[PDB]
Write a protein that binds this ligand. Structure first.
Ligand SMILES: O=c1ccn([C@H]2C[C@H](O)[C@@H](COP(=O)(O)O)O2)c(=O)[nH]1
Ligand code: SF4
Length: 206
């Protein structure tokens, strides 16, 4: 099923990342430039999971390097979390996208539940490799990957969750995706940023 046979029996993140480059677990590898594995080391206490690499990440080979990542950086710094101490990844490892004519970037398309479930063996391998104390789930796709397809981020914001399905039983904190804080009225963007900082601090206080 999905990516499972492409995942090697090792927890070395370098070997896992190289193997993900060869994954064909769903259709998304075809049009993407490369797989984007997570970034960080196995000593990390906090793992953070987004949806997928975007346009910038697809070509950089690293997660959260575009506008959403710069906003995330600002939130982390405000929460006194050192990004180099995190393990940062995504629920799906290949960018799913289209282009619009006259557009200034490739625009992401939402992974189907099928693609999320197909790619989840990589996330499980990352979680068993890193053994985080806490997992921050940035946005609906990542949160649903571990908490179920019906899960609503908006309804559980600053809550420490635990589900028996997850290897290692880390605490789980589901929050807004940083990209959602890029646009909208200023007061709403400012209130939403504060809430993201709060949720990051919940995770770091686990
Ligand atoms: O590492 C990443 C980078 C971007 N994303 C998402 C965030 C946004 O909704 C889109 C585009 O990211 P952006 O940094 O805003 O260009 O992809 C992600 O889920 N994980
Ligand atoms: S998105 Fe995930 S399951 Fe699909 S081909 Fe890429 S690494 Fe494999």
């Amino acid at each position: 099923a999905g990516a499972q046979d492409f995942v090697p029996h090792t927890a070395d993140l370098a070997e896992l990342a190289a193997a993900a480059g060869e994954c064909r677990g769903c259709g998304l590898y075809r049009d993407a430039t490369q797989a984007v594995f997570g970034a960080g080391g196995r000593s990390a206490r906090i793992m953070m999971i987004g949806e997928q690499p975007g346009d910038k990440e697809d070509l950089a080979g690293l997660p959260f390097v575009g506008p959403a990542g710069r906003l995330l950086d600002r939130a982390l710094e405000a929460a006194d979390i050192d990004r180099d101490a995190l393990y940062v990844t995504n629920a799906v490892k290949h960018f799913k996208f289209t282009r619009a004519a006259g557009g200034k970037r490739r625009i992401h398309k939402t992974p189907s539940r099928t693609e999320v479930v197909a790619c989840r063996p990589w996330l499980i391998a990352e979680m068993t490799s890193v053994e985080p104390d806490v997992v921050v789930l940035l946005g609906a796709t990542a949160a649903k990957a571990l908490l179920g397809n019906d899960f609503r981020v908006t309804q559980h914001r600053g809550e420490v969750l635990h589900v028996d399905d997850v290897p290692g039983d880390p605490a789980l904190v589901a929050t807004v995706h940083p990209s959602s804080l890029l646009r909208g009225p200023k007061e709403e963007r400012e209130s939403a940023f504060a809430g993201l900082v709060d949720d990051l601090r919940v995770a770091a206080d686990v």
